[PDB]
């Protein structure tokens, strides 16, 4: 594609913001964002404490230098620091001492499932040497108690508490175990961005300037003989190319083509609802947990026989975070609370949706290469890529590279490799 | 050209020797000479009498995992030996008030003081291999780390591998870098390690059983003299004749036993450096830290520590075996103190072992690789820690590399990570 083209990026989440940021180096870019900030799932909400204002990540928060080399380099290039926020996990079920945790060997669920936690690490480490985690567990003789009291809870930390996590791709889970992201024996190795995840997006927003249109949801995207027409904010805008950084769900709604292969490729993408509640109600902390960053509680009334229908809640104790250590205010995040959180203690709520990561869903992502470039249209974002923020931002980069702007970090071996892998995965 | 049914002696019955002999015996008439009363060397499990049974407590070698040690793991699996996760939780204590850090939680004044440095270090060790023939100390100096980090954090955590007498800050950087990137050592989590069920001695017990009368226990070799006919082994007041002789002893021992006019041997073997280690199996609970909660490894630096005299001062490392998951019902205290400064109450001491470890300075690695020049000459072969990558996998795989060269192929070719490790160690050894 020809230089100085008029390009629109639709959706200002991580993939869109990074796509736009790089595209603007060669093209006349405009970034449309439905909401009042750049970042989407990457949102840091200001909380007022006894130490000043903290920007508390409510969605996206975790990455590391190995898993997310491009995001890491981006942060580093921007002067943004990071810190280690280990994924310590405590799981509570109804009963007396019906728990296990990441940090120690205490709890009755640990006594009950000790052998299984052990074998699972071994097997996940031996695995990399296309099924679901559940199929694997069934097939390799793991107890139903392990599936629903250990596996499903630990996976909800990724997938949300409404997610059919046991149907998600095994390699996703195997890799997380072998890379020390999830573990039944130690707190996993993760980092957070200093000043919250929003910090890198703040800089992208500053760099893009008036090219960014906030609170401007795109209503329709209509390719024509002359170009592509974007209906947003009660006006009509004209472009040569349009980059989609929105979810497949949204993209289909916004897309206005006679072509019905679009309905085929974009319809049928499956999602999971997630509610993130930022609150100060300490009653959500476990009396046995407390110390653990991630605290999963399964409510009273759980039955193994009907486990498939029941769901818990996940609470994050932000006070455990090193930079929050002098803060005397409780800072808590409950994802998918079953009971209502005391609204006199609630700071803010966010409602989002995540993709399902079943092996069929992975096939569905890859197939999007068929419509890539057609009718002056491009696609990036989580639904075109590997899961996680690196996958998201790198998809944006893959599109920018295809549209003239090369991968910005070629001398960074792991960053370049990730770009190459994601470009291959996208079929671009 | 070496051929089948040769008379081969393996000198030294530690891990490398026992595995070398075990595989060699498939093709050759093998004899295994061992100085001590058991097969295993640094791999020693001592029986301890408790109210829930007699436990075989590893005093030396204890840790490995399925990724780091694929050949040993497969060997254990083939023998029907189970393993269990024994995470490397570490607690460090220095003389003041709450002058500690640990890798389970963010408590302690040393954590407060050095938290940011721990953090940067992880980042940098993870970024290192994707880019440096310095030592860990040179790195630390050069990348602006405080002296307090070098001696209150790095040196103590490194003693878990190296021993408390070790100049660990002189050891190769990539050794440390890899340990941090592979979650073996960490300032943020307990590292991923396994132990063998029934102790490490279990796999050796089986090798010993399989070898039978080919094993000569309590038979230290006095001299190894190559002749025009073959090689002569002087051991136990007798003279034994062999076609080939496989050395599985430390380089210093090898040079002492080795008897030739050739002085390239003196050049290649004479400059190997070691560190003494004393392992004390006891029941004196006064050695546990009052703050060092559930930590497996507990390092204590005695009163009188001075940062200026850090180079010459040394702590002690205590292992709390009662924290091990299979030892959870044991009411008896089971403890191992490495290099105790003060004497352990001898009315509470079960047994002591005295060993020596190699130094792993960048020069020492160069020295190991160099041993390819004498490999095969005068019917002589060399395996063991001083010819290989450090650790038990490196040790047992060196034994395998020699067995492969002498006709018996690597036993696990269809195990991709086991085969890869063999290939790497064979390349490193230059065999
Ligand atoms: C609660 C939660 C926690 C998470 N935690 C992590 C984590 O710790 N680590 C990690 O790696 N990943 C995490 N993720 C995954 C996350 O989805 C990805 O990391 C990444 O943020 C998704 O990138 P995206 O740009 O494709 O999606 P989004 O961030 O969802 O971006 C889509 C954007 O499109 C906008 N949009 C919608 N409609 C329109 C319209 N009509 N016109 C214009 N714009 C529109 C939206 O407002 C939004 O800004 C989390 C997700 C959730 C929901
Ligand atoms: C305290 C301690 C703890 C350790 N812990 C671990 C751990 O957890 N994990 C790990 O991977 N590694 C560990 N190691 C490292 C250890 O060096 C290797 O794992 C491995 O045991 C070395 O095996 P080797 O056969 O090369 O040497 P050694 O085990 O030292 O064996 C050499 C053998 O030669 C014999 N010998 C000596 N002189 C003569 C002679 N004249 N004639 C015949 N035989 C002789 C000795 O008795 C001995 O059995 C530890 C070492 C020590 C000292
Ligand atoms: C390295 C890289 O980018 O590639 C791998 C992806 C490994 C994942 C990205 C690791 C998971 C996320 O980064 C972490 C997501 C986050 C912590 C979940 C939601 N977070 C919260 O709720 C926080 C903890 O509060 C490849 C996998 O991606 C595919 O989507 C997946 C289904 C696979 O099959 C591949 C193995
Ligand atoms: C690939 C491989 O197998 O080896 C790598 C090094 C990683 C080590 C082998 C890990 C160290 C040991 O296996 C474990 C040491 C052990 C815990 C010793 C002491 N233990 C105790 O004293 C108590 C009982 O726990 C590569 C490095 O090996 C070399 O020896 C080293 C000097 C290097 O620089 C290489 C990079
Ligand atoms: Ca406080
Ligand atoms: Ca203080
Ligand atoms: Ca010292």
Numbering used by the authors:
A (entry chain B): 4 to 132, 140 to 438
B (entry chain A): 3 to 133, 139 to 438
Authors' own words:
The enzyme LkcE from the lankacidin polyketide biosynthetic pathway of the bacterium Streptomyces rochei represents an interesting test case for understanding such gain-of-function, as it exhibits a monoamine oxidase (MAO) protein fold yet also carries out a macrocyclization reaction. The catalytic mechanism proposed for LkcE involves initial oxidation of the amide function of LC-KA05 to an iminium ion. This is followed by attack of a C-2 enolate anion on the iminium to give the 17-membered lankacidinol A (2)8—an enzymatic intramolecular Mannich reaction.
In order to obtain complexes with LC-KA05, mutants E64A, E64Q, Y182F, R326L, and R326Q were soaked with the 1/7 substrate mixture followed by rapid acquisition of the X-ray diffraction data (owing both to the low availability of LC-KA05 and its high instability, it was not possible to carry out co-crystallization experiments). Of the five mutants, only E64Q and R326Q yielded co-complexes with 1; 7 was not observed in the active sites, as the acetate of 1 was clearly visible. The structure of the LkcE E64Q/LC-KA05 complex was solved at 3.03 Å resolution and that of the LkcE R326Q/LC-KA05 complex at 2.50 Å resolution by molecular replacement, using the structure of the LkcE/EMAA/DATD complex as the search model, and the presence of LC-KA05 confirmed using a weighted Fo−Fc omit map. LC-KA05 lies at the interface between the substrate-binding domain and the cofactor-binding domain and adopts an extended conformation. The substrate sits in a deep pocket (∼ 20 Å from the protein surface and ~ 6−8 Å wide), and is surrounded by hydrophobic residues (L70, Y168, Y182, L185, M189, W200, L324, F345, V396, and G398). In addition to these hydrophobic interactions, binding is likely mediated by seven hydrogen bonds: two to the lactone ring at the entry point of the pocket (by N179 and T397), one to the acetate at C-7 by the side chain of Q428, and four to the lactoyl moiety (two with Y168, and one each with E64 and R326). Notably, in this configuration, the lactoyl portion of LC-KA05 stacks against the FAD isoalloxazine in a position appropriate for hydride transfer (the amide proton is situated at 3.2 Å from the FAD N-5). On the other hand, superposition of the R326Q/LC-KA05 structure and that of the holo wild type shows that if LC-KA05 bound into the wild type in the same orientation as in the LkcE R326Q/LC-KA05 complex, its C-24 hydroxyl would sterically clash with R326. Indeed, the fact that the R326Q mutant retains essentially wild-type activity means that we have not simply captured a non-productive complex with the enzyme. Taken together, these data are consistent with residues E64 and R326 playing critical roles in the catalytic mechanism (although R can be substituted by Q without a significant effect on activity), whereas Y182 is not essential.
